[PDB]
RNA sequence: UUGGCACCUCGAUGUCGGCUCAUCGCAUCCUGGGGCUGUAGUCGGUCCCAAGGGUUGGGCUGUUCGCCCAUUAAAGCGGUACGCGAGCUGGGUUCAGAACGUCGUGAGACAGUUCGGUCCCUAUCCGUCGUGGGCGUAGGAAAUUUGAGAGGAGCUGUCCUUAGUACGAGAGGACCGGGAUGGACAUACCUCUGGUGUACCAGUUGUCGUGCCAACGGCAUAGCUGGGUAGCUAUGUGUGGACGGGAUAAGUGCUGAAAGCAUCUAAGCAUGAAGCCCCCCUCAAGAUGAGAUUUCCCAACUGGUUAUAAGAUCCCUCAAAGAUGAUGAGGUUAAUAGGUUCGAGGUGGAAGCAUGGUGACAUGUGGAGCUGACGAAUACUAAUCGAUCGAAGACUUAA
């Protein structure tokens, strides 16, 4: 979509990592470009979790690391995260610009689940 | 290449005419009471309320 | 084109030709179906002759969106008139050969 | 798909064309007007490619006529093609059959369904 | 002769009355109103303005140009016509329309006429010598360190400077280019589109002004 | 060009030939216009005007020149440090090795010949190519423009008709007029044919994991392979060099004396080039000679000022624009992006199950399932609240 200063599958890895960290923590402080890009990745998994079937669990399992909370991340999604967002039709996140970072000047935002 | 002639301290300052940095483009927070930067979270106290 | 080992679809003893020149205009760099070329026989030889391009891998467009690509390239040697120096043509042959007043060739071909 | 590209080319999309598929085998009829006389010159070959554009969709038919394999690329909605007739239907496992451009004998064959 | 303004929708293709396939550009025009009429008795030439894209009405937030501003609305209210994007002037048409804006429908054009279509070219930023001026490139393999740069930029010491017009890398595309002698395959009224023979300057949704050929 | 001189440079002005890019002269190779011919016609020869455009690809040679091949309308001649090495090469040329012939007693030299042999640089100024800001154009703006001036383009073939007519024993074979269609070159675009397509689909190989089977994930050039959407493209698809004017060169004249005649010239009047100025395409009012048309805005106090108006931005969502800035599309009184739901197109028949096989696997469920850029629709998330800038119009004369 937009290249993130990374190589292709390195970028794939970074996005998978951020989506897992998001649905585990429910809010993460990241860079605005990374947040813009994860916004369109963590929000296509909540759709699969609102579907719920076996095929949806596996399509979600192929874009989601393994970290136990005890639960998994995937049980977290097809379990208790997908139920809270049952009524709204898309728009399951938001970005909040904290501001510039020291050492970078990177635009730091806070992304989260609505 | 190398400079053929050392630069006067007039041409220098003319070239640094545009070496400014603008102000950030800030506002005052209606909640915190102080200056925040527009479209950003308030530094001092908490909320954004947009 | 300008170095291309065409095959000869016409049993004139020559079986392979090297494109030496495309005739027409100063600096023309490519010829297609229905275009006299100068070639030299590489297989049966060693003499300059003028062939026409009966087939082409790139094919033609036919002016209605009908592209006709062929499996390989092929020429047919020509006399001073457009008459083929040989006797029998081989394999298919496109229509634009029929249109450039090569009627003695399209007659002999096995199918157009 | 624009609603304005579409709905202006509705006067060209045709309905008297069967539903063929790559891997199939067609007899296509075409109206030559060469000279001053027209004739319906059949062309019998296996369908190698079928793109899609709506009113810009085309398809390619291949045949090893006699020692020389020739492909021809028609548009579907040409008012030059009279009818397609589907002789056979083959099992091919994919859309564009380009491997047949390097096969002649028992290798450049196709199945029935 | 009454040129129109329009928007390049895309390209498609049709089939003539001999099956002779024609690629054709769909240019859709609508709301062409004639706003002002320039006459030599006040300003030294003859012409007519025409506006094409309707905007909203005047507003007070009005922070995006989707809304007309007050000068634009005075100008368009002179004609009793809504404020419009893309006001353009047409010379070479004998002024026979109304200073009161009447819709110029595409029906002004018949199929068997001929056209020239002005639009800005499509942009391509800072495109270097080989891409921009069709220059050849240096050899790639026989020990050469010259591949895509421009050649020399002058003579040695008897010129002593570069001449104006020297072709160098810079920003490419975006020009007001005109094509000529295009034809009109079909004037689709009631859908309000014109089908031109070819493909016209500009991107999709790029404004194009159609008029009759100067030749 | 081969020289002559030895005036600048030895505290350094880098060689020949190719590559990239050209630009100028005319002593014209082609195309344009003519005179004279020992010009029947076609085809020529020799002069005269003309520099608008065009002027091939290979073999051999370090090579230039030069010969040959195959074309072309033609394959011009020169200058620019025999243009251009802070744009490229480094084949030859004069570095160190080695050898041949020859000369030298010798160390070693070429009339030579042959094989090998480090080509450095981050651009300060002018220059050029793009692109912004400050002020200006006697109020502040938004939009549309005229166009002084500048730039681009400018080439040509072959078929058919006049007509197998004119001219000619015959052979041959046209001028002028009319179309069709090509080459080279510009240019615009992506419908079509192809190319690419590293967040698309499928197949398969090894090995390591998700406890195990099935299903998937990591790494192996993107592991590899078959397709491929948007975009960017050419080899693809459109168009262009048309048509005409005004003045002219060589040229042909018309009238006409100087010169009772003769005379294109002295007065005067015509005709006459691919060339000149127009026409065609573009840029252009910083065109300080700063143009013009329309529309909008215009009050409260102390000679002047103020914030404010119309308007424009800071800030944010973006792309048809883009190195950045700028240009465009929006900022909720909202479809700008993302999500969600439908499509298109792409791949090509998902998992689960059931069935048929002992097994690899096959069929149905089912054109299935997945789908980046493309089209719509939906305020679900985010374009919040805010702030900065920005006039109230000088002086003479004339009507």
TrEMBL record, chain A:
<dbReference type="GO" id="GO:0022625">
    <property type="term" value="C:cytosolic large ribosomal subunit"/>
</dbReference>
<dbReference type="GO" id="GO:0006412">
    <property type="term" value="P:translation"/>
</dbReference>
<keyword id="KW-0689">Ribosomal protein</keyword>
<dbReference type="GO" id="GO:0003735">
    <property type="term" value="F:structural constituent of ribosome"/>
</dbReference>
<dbReference type="Pfam" id="PF01196">
    <property type="entry name" value="Ribosomal_L17"/>
</dbReference>
<dbReference type="InterPro" id="IPR000456">
    <property type="entry name" value="Ribosomal_bL17"/>
</dbReference>
<keyword id="KW-0687">Ribonucleoprotein</keyword>
<comment type="subunit">
    <text>Part of the 50S ribosomal subunit. Contacts protein L32.</text>
</comment>
<comment type="similarity">
    <text>Belongs to the bacterial ribosomal protein bL17 family.</text>
</comment>
<dbReference type="InterPro" id="IPR036373">
    <property type="entry name" value="Ribosomal_bL17_sf"/>
</dbReference>
<protein>
    <recommendedName>
        <fullName>Large ribosomal subunit protein bL17</fullName>
    </recommendedName>
</protein>
<dbReference type="InterPro" id="IPR047859">
    <property type="entry name" value="Ribosomal_bL17_CS"/>
</dbReference>
Automatic annotation (TrEMBL), chain B:
<dbReference type="GO" id="GO:0006412">
    <property type="term" value="P:translation"/>
</dbReference>
<dbReference type="GO" id="GO:0003735">
    <property type="term" value="F:structural constituent of ribosome"/>
</dbReference>
<dbReference type="InterPro" id="IPR002677">
    <property type="entry name" value="Ribosomal_bL32"/>
</dbReference>
<keyword id="KW-0687">Ribonucleoprotein</keyword>
<dbReference type="GO" id="GO:0015934">
    <property type="term" value="C:large ribosomal subunit"/>
</dbReference>
<dbReference type="InterPro" id="IPR011332">
    <property type="entry name" value="Ribosomal_zn-bd"/>
</dbReference>
<comment type="similarity">
    <text>Belongs to the bacterial ribosomal protein bL32 family.</text>
</comment>
<protein>
    <recommendedName>
        <fullName>Large ribosomal subunit protein bL32</fullName>
    </recommendedName>
</protein>
<dbReference type="InterPro" id="IPR044957">
    <property type="entry name" value="Ribosomal_bL32_bact"/>
</dbReference>
<keyword id="KW-0689">Ribosomal protein</keyword>
<dbReference type="Pfam" id="PF01783">
    <property type="entry name" value="Ribosomal_L32p"/>
</dbReference>
TrEMBL record, chain D:
<dbReference type="InterPro" id="IPR038657">
    <property type="entry name" value="Ribosomal_bL19_sf"/>
</dbReference>
<dbReference type="InterPro" id="IPR008991">
    <property type="entry name" value="Translation_prot_SH3-like_sf"/>
</dbReference>
<keyword id="KW-0689">Ribosomal protein</keyword>
<dbReference type="InterPro" id="IPR001857">
    <property type="entry name" value="Ribosomal_bL19"/>
</dbReference>
<dbReference type="GO" id="GO:0003735">
    <property type="term" value="F:structural constituent of ribosome"/>
</dbReference>
<dbReference type="Pfam" id="PF01245">
    <property type="entry name" value="Ribosomal_L19"/>
</dbReference>
<dbReference type="GO" id="GO:0006412">
    <property type="term" value="P:translation"/>
</dbReference>
<comment type="function">
    <text>This protein is located at the 30S-50S ribosomal subunit interface and may play a role in the structure and function of the aminoacyl-tRNA binding site.</text>
</comment>
<comment type="similarity">
    <text>Belongs to the bacterial ribosomal protein bL19 family.</text>
</comment>
<keyword id="KW-0687">Ribonucleoprotein</keyword>
<protein>
    <recommendedName>
        <fullName>Large ribosomal subunit protein bL19</fullName>
    </recommendedName>
</protein>
<dbReference type="InterPro" id="IPR018257">
    <property type="entry name" value="Ribosomal_bL19_CS"/>
</dbReference>
UniProtKB/TrEMBL annotation, chain E:
<dbReference type="GO" id="GO:0019843">
    <property type="term" value="F:rRNA binding"/>
</dbReference>
<comment type="similarity">
    <text>Belongs to the universal ribosomal protein uL3 family.</text>
</comment>
<comment type="function">
    <text>One of the primary rRNA binding proteins, it binds directly near the 3'-end of the 23S rRNA, where it nucleates assembly of the 50S subunit.</text>
</comment>
<dbReference type="InterPro" id="IPR019927">
    <property type="entry name" value="Ribosomal_uL3_bac/org-type"/>
</dbReference>
<keyword id="KW-0479">Metal-binding</keyword>
<dbReference type="InterPro" id="IPR009000">
    <property type="entry name" value="Transl_B-barrel_sf"/>
</dbReference>
<dbReference type="InterPro" id="IPR019926">
    <property type="entry name" value="Ribosomal_uL3_CS"/>
</dbReference>
<dbReference type="GO" id="GO:0003735">
    <property type="term" value="F:structural constituent of ribosome"/>
</dbReference>
<dbReference type="InterPro" id="IPR000597">
    <property type="entry name" value="Ribosomal_uL3"/>
</dbReference>
<feature type="binding site">
    <location>
        <position position="136"/>
    </location>
    <ligand>
        <name>Mg(2+)</name>
    </ligand>
</feature>
<keyword id="KW-0689">Ribosomal protein</keyword>
<comment type="subunit">
    <text>Part of the 50S ribosomal subunit. Forms a cluster with proteins L14 and L19.</text>
</comment>
